[PDB]
Amino acid sequence: SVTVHSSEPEVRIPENNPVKLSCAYSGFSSPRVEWKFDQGDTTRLVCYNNKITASYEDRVTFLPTGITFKSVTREDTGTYTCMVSEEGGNSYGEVKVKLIVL
Amino acid sequence: SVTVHSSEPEVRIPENNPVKLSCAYSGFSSPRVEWKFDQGDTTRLVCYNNKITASYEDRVTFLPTGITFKSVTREDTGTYTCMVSEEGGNSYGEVKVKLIVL
Amino acid sequence: SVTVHSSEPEVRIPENNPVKLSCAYSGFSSPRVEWKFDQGDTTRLVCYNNKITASYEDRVTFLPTGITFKSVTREDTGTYTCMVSEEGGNSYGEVKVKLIVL
Amino acid sequence: NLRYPIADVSGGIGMSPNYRFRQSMWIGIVSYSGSGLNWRVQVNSDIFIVDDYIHICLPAFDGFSIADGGDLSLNFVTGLLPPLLTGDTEPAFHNDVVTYGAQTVAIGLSSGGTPQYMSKNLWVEQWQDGVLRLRVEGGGSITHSNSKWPAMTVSYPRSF
Amino acid sequence: SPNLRYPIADVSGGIGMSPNYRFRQSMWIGIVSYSGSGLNWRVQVNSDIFIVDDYIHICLPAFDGFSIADGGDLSLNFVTGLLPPLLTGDTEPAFHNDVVTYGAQTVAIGLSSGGTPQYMSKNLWVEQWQDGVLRLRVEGGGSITHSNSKWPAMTVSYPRSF
Amino acid sequence: PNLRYPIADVSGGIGMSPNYRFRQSMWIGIVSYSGSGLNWRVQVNSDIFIVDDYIHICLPAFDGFSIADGGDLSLNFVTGLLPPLLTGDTEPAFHNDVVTYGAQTVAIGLSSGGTPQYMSKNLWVEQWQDGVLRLRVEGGGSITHSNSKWPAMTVSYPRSF
């Protein structure tokens, strides 16, 4: 049984400031972390395979404990879902973090 | 090598009775068993990969020591061949059982 | 880490005589040796996978220390390149020998 | 303490060559069907098992009328050369219906004549009781009595 | 076993090969989108997905579309439509996001203006995968004027990232 | 040590060598058509991927001249491969036997300068000998022409080990 939860299930930070969404996971050996941004009707890929996508590469860095932004904007207010799958897909974890930019 | 023989190389059982065709094999670790029915000049698949086929699933069960019928009819009189191949195909065994429905 | 060099980096032998181009390698466990003949612009395969090709099989034998000719002619003057790759291609060695049939 | 495909390779723990490359042959019957049209052809094809895949190299062959939508069936119940078993041609997805390996394949159609080639769609549809059924449809059609088929190689994950 | 690294794992006691590595079946119900020479349109589709060893196969069913240019891009959006446990990241090629011409194959497409379809033999291949969106190049085979296009079932494969 | 490739040491534990799983390279060599007296060659740049026990050669699209109904397309791997690739690495598992492996349909445009007409032809890996892979290319049907446009084709087959 693997564990994947978040310490800060709901962040609220002022515009143009740095912020880290923490996804702390345990119980994996060969895990693949993946984050997806959610702004209502649209989903966007932020990070996949412990690697940040191109559309974000310039202002979001990865870490096994969460992704952190160089600076945020209202544009990024939404529900970020962090998914951690093991190798083989027999171990799966997931947790959503809610971001609110001001 | 490996051994694949039969204790009952020839069965003779009255219609509508259950009957088991015994194929006893030894010398395999990851074997795949397969049976083929033979009535004259038409070959039919009974069991493959230690799994009974669809056309027989409803009245024939599998066992590492042979397949057994819920009930037989003259329709099934013929030469059933049991083949046991190892994984990789370096070990191969085979024996024929003749069924006669009285 | 692996070593592939030659003791006789330039051979000079009279026509119709036997000659051995030596390629001494060390550092490999499951190596695949390969020789290529070079006459200006035309490249030809001499040996591949510790096995002499067809077009040469009748007058060139293989050896872990180099290929030897039954008899040579000026047709064979050129730069013979010996390549030694490991299994997986992580270990690669190479050395060229220049033959001059006088 | 080694379970195939992991096995002993020259003293050390390696990979069984039978897993990597296994070559065979099938000399059986390919049978077309659909819209009442039926016919069969005996054929000689090579069979390669590489890793978890199985490849059936069907050579080119001639046939008769074919409907717009039809099924081509290879009967593996017979024709396989020892030590191959019909059960060795079972897909990893067992007998579910799929649309695996969908590919385009040109067939020449003639009335005895000068063949006119149709680009048709073909794929592994379903394997049941040793009989592999490929769906062959699309590409439009014309009236004909003869059909020329190309060499086709059919592949798919193999059951273990 | 503690000292075993996938795909090598514990099978029936012995050191064996993980079945999840050998065969892993899934599905995608997403959006395929054509584009090129100003022509744009999308289609919702249901395709099976098989992962065999180090390859990944996407069995696209046949589907219908609109006008298409001589040279175009067909994009599968894997950001959504995948079946748990599958992750969009799992659809990433071994050659990551470089541009390639992998799996080049011929594929016939029927083009019509409502009436009877005329089939074109076009060239298609895996071009590049970026941010969960697989883009296949589809060009060649000449063209004619049309408003509708019928596509065949196509299976797309390529080395999968690990 | 006690491990035989493709089984190797992966971060302390017994794993699978990544070189076995994915190995990428390139070939910049000569493809040569032939058959019915027609002869011509073309220099090309193709990627090469080795995945597991397979080898894929991604031939880009290219232009050529006249072609017979039945012909042979030969990739000369004796040269053009990029280190550490060896011509011997291109040898099929079935060594140099003659086969009909990877048979596929491939459309080729034929023209006489002007507009191209595409033929659906049959192509497959026929035989590999002395570093030269020969693919058979026949059927379709055909017609008069002086130029031929080829599509990007990926050729695959079990690789020798």
Numbering used by the authors:
A (entry chain I), B (entry chain H), C (entry chain G): 28 to 129
D (entry chain B): 295 to 454
E (entry chain C): 293 to 454
F (entry chain A): 294 to 454
Quote what the paper states about this structure.
The σ1 molecule is about 480 Å in length and composed of a filamentous N-terminal tail and a globular C-terminal head.
To define the structural basis of σ1-JAM-A interactions, we crystallized a complex of the head domain of T3D σ1 and the D1 domain of human JAM-A (hJAM-A) and determined its structure at 3.4 Å resolution. A T3D σ1 fragment comprising the head domain and one β-spiral of the tail (σ1H; residues 293–455) and the D1 domain of hJAM-A (D1; residues 28–129) were purified using glutathione S-transferase (GST)-affinity purification. The crystallographic asymmetric unit consists of two σ1H trimers, each bound to three D1 monomers. The crystallized complex consists of a σ1H trimer ligated by three D1 monomers. D1 residues involved in contact formation are located at the most membrane-distal (top) part of the domain and on the face that mediates homodimer formation. Reovirus σ1H engages JAM-A D1 using two main contact areas: a larger region centered at the D–E loop and its 310 helix, just below the β-barrel, and a smaller region formed by the top of the β-spiral and the α-helix. Contacts are largely polar, featuring numerous hydrogen bonds and two salt bridges. Instead, extensive hydrophobic interactions with substantial surface complementarity are found, indicating that this area also plays an important role in defining specificity and providing high affinity.
